[PDB]
Amino acid sequence: GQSSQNTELPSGLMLGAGSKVVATQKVHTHGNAQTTTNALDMMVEGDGFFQV
Amino acid sequence: SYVSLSGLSAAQLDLNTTSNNIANANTYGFKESRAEFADVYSNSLFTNAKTTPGGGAQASQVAQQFHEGSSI
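ok -> structure tokens follow
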């Protein structure tokens, strides 16, 4: 904001209203692999989802 | 452990059969016996053969080898 004629407010009196949690980010980084003997259980090595 | 315990029983059956032949080294008309074994593998629909080991050793039959013996 303009004070005088050439001097401008370098920083203003701005009061914050607090904080909040705006989002919950599902981090879809790949998990590890469990080695099993069952033949009916599979795993997606990379991007992809099974369909139901 | 069960596959190892199968091996001990198979190895013990051979030893018992061999001992029986030696014990009857003098009896008249005796015919020696030979122990024969067989493998075991049984894989379910839900089991992935590529990651499976065998079931051990199974005794198949104790024969009765009937070849002619020496004459006294």
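The CA atoms of residues 26 and 72 of chain B lie 11 Å apart.
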